[PDB]
Amino acid sequence: RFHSFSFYELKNVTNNFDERPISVGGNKMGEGGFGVVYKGYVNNTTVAVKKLTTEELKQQFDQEIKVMAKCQHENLVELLGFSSDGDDLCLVYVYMPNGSLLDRLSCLDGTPPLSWHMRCKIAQGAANGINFLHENHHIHRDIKSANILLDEAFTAKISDFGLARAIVGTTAYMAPEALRGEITPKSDIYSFGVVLLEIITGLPAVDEHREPQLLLDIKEEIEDEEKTIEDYIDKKMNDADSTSVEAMYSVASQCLHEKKNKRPDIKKVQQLLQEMT
Ligand SMILES: Cc1ncc(-c2nc3c(OC4(C)CC4)nc(Nc4cnn(C5CCN(C)CC5)c4)nc3cc2F)cn1
Numbered sequence: 001r002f003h004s005f006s007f008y009e010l011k012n013v014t015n016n017f018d019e020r021p022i023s024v025g026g027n028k029m030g031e032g033g034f035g036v037v038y039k040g041y042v043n044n045t046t047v048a049v050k051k052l053t054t055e056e057l058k059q060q061f062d063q064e065i066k067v068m069a070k071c072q073h074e075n076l077v078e079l080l081g082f083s084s085d086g087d088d089l090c091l092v093y094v095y096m097p098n099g100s101l102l103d104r105l106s107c108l109d110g111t112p113p114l115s116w117h118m119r120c121k122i123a124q125g126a127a128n129g130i131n132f133l134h135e136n137h138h139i140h141r142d143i144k145s146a147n148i149l150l151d152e153a154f155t156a157k158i159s160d161f162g163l164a165r166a167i168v169g170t171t172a173y174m175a176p177e178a179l180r181g182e183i184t185p186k187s188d189i190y191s192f193g194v195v196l197l198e199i200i201t202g203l204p205a206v207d208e209h210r211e212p213q214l215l216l217d218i219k220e221e222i223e224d225e226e227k228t229i230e231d232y233i234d235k236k237m238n239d240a241d242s243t244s245v246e247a248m249y250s251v252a253s254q255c256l257h258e259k260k261n262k263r264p265d266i267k268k269v270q271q272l273l274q275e276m277t
Pocket residue numbers: 029030031033037048050077078093094095096097098099100108109110111149159160161162
C-alpha cells in the first residue's frame with residue numbers, strides 16, 4: 001500500500017497507451033479529469049491507468065495520492081500505484097468493471113438499465129463514501145455521477161480526489177456559494193442532490209438540447225406544480241414505487257436548498273436514505 005511503477009511497465013501493459021477504444025482492439029476506456037484512462041494488467045489484476053497549470057497538475061497528482069493514503073472505505077476507489085517520470089504522470093487504480101454511474105444511467109455501450117433496487121443501493125453507497133470524507137474533514141469539491149464508479153457488485157465508489165482538501169468543479173453540479181468561491185462540505189451536499197436527481201430521472205445534469213437545460217431546475221418546476229416527480233421518473237425501470245421515489249426526491253430537494261445552512265448534513269442524508277428502504 002502502494003507501489004511506484006516504471007512508466008515503461010505501464011506503457012507496456014496498456015499496449016503503448018493505445019488510444020483506440022477497447023471495442024476496436026485498443027486500451028482506451030475513457031477520457032475526463034485531465035486525462036485518458038487505459039485498461040492495463042498486473043499479474044492477477046486488471047487495472048485502470050489514468051495518464052494525466054504545469055505545476056498545478058503535479059499538485060493535483062500529489063493531492064490525490066495524499067487523500068488515498070488517508071481515506072480507505074468500501075465506498076471510495078482504491079489506488080494501487082503511481083508512476084511519476086519526468087513530465088509523464090500515471091495513477092493506477094483497481095479496475096471498476098461497471099464503469100461510472102453517469103454511463104450506466106445513460107446505458108452507454110448497450111449496458112442494461114439499472115433497476116430502482118440497484119439505484120437505491122448506489123445512492124446509499126455514494127452517501128456512505130461522502131460521509132467517510134466529511135467525518136475525516138475532507139471536502140470532495142467535484143461530486144458528480146462521472147465520479148461515482150461501480151464495481152463487480154454495483155457498489156458505489158467515490159472517485160477523483162484531485163480537487164479535494166480540508167473556482168473549480170463542474171458547473172451543472174455546483175452550489176451557488178461554490179460558484180462564488182466558497183469552500184464548504186455543504187456544497188458537496190448540493191452536488192449529491194443533483195446526482196440523486198440523475199438517479200431518479202436517468203437524465204444528464206446538463207443538456208443544451210433540453211428544457212430545462214439544467215436538471216437541478218426541475219426542482220422549481222415541481223415546487224411551482226408545473227410538473228410532478230412522477231412525470232420525471234426514469235421510464236427505463238419496472239420496479240420503482242412512488243413512496244420510495246418521493247422519499248429519494250425529498251432528500252434531493254433538501255440537498256438542493258439554495259441556502260447552504262438549510263441543507264441537511266451528510267449524516268442526515270444517510271439516515272433519510274436508510275429510512276427510504
Ligand atoms: C482520479 C481517478 N480517475 C479514474 C479512476 C478510475 N476510473 C475508472 C474508469 O474510468 C472511466 C469511467 C473513464 C473510463 N473506468 C473503469 N472501468 C470501466 C470503464 N468502462 N468500463 C466499461 C467497459 C464497457 N462496458 C460495456 C461497460 C463498462 C469499465 N474503472 C475505473 C477505475 C478507476 F479507479 C479513479 N480515480
